[PDB]
Amino acid sequence: ACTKNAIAQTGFNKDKYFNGDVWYVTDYLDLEPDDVPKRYCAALAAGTASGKLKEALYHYDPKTQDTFYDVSELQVESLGKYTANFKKVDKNGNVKVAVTAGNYYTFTVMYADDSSALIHTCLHKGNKDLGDLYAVLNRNKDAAAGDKVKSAVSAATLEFSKFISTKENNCAYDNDSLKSLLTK
Numbered sequence: 001a002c003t004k005n006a007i008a009q010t011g012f013n014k015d016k017y018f019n020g021d022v023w024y025v026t027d028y029l030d031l032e033p034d035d036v037p038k039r040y041c042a043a044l045a046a047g048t049a050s051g052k053l054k055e056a057l058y059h060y061d062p063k064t065q066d067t068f069y070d071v072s073e074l075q076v077e078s079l080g081k082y083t084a085n086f087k088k089v090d091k092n093g094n095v096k097v098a099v100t101a102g103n104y105y106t107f108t109v110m111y112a113d114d115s116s117a118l119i120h121t122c123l124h125k126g127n128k129d130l131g132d133l134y135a136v137l138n139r140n141k142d143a144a145a146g147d148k149v150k151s152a153v154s155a156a157t158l159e160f161s162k163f164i165s166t167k168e169n170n171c172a173y174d175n176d177s178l179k180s181l182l183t184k
C-alpha cells in the first residue's frame with residue numbers, strides 16, 4: 001500500500017534534473033521495509049529525448065544477481081510530480097515486457113540541486129504496489145549524503161539514519177546504457 005502524497009520541491013528546476021545525465025541511488029527507505037531487499041543497487045537516467053520526458057532505470061540485486069532495465073515515458077501531474085509508464089528492456093532497449101495500463105509508477109522530486117536529490121516513488125504492477133519508496137540520489141556514485149539532502153529528508157519528517165545505504169554492495173553501473181535508453 002502507498003500512503004504518502006509527496007510534496008514536490010518548491011521552485012523545482014525541471015531542465016536541470018532532466019538533463020540527460022545519470023543519478024545513482026545512494027540510500028533508500030521503503031515504508032513497507034519488507035517489500036525490498038536489504039542490499040540493492042539502482043540508478044536512473046532522466047532527460048528529454050526528441051521532445052518526450054523520459055527516464056531509464058537500472059535495478060540490480062547484488063546477492064541474487066537479478067538485473068533489469070526499464071524505459072519510462074513520464075506524464076506531468078504538476079511541477080516535479082509525474083506518472084510513468086514502464087517497459088522492461090534489455091540494456092540495448094529491446095522490449096522484454098511492453099507498456100501495459102496497470103504497470104506504472106508515480107515519481108515526485110521532493111528536493112534537487114545540481115548534485116543531489118530526494119525522490120518518492122509508488123510502484124504499481126496491476127493490483128500490487130511496492131510501498132512508499134524514498135531514495136537519496138547523487139550524481140557521484142560514491143558520495144556520502146551531504147547537508148542539503150539530509151536536511152530535506154528531515155523536512156519531509158523522515159530520519160536519514162533510518163535509510164539503507166547502497167554503498168557497501170560493490171555496485172557497478174553501465175552509464176552508457178542508461179543514457180542511450182533515454183532514446184528508446
Ligand code: HEM
Pocket residue numbers: 025028035036037039040041042043044057059068069070086087088097105107121123125130133135
Ligand atoms: C530510483 C528509483 C526507482 C524507481 C523509479 C523504481 C521503479 C521500479 C519499476 C518501474 C519496477 C518494475 C520493473 C519492471 O517490472 O519492469 C521496479 C521494480 C523493483 N524495484 Fe524499483 N525503482 C526505483 C528504485 C528501487 C530501489 C532503490 C529499490 C530497493 C531495493 C528497488 C527495488 C525494487 C524491486 C525489489 C523491484 C521488483 C518488484 C517486483 O518484483 O514486483 N527499486 N522498480
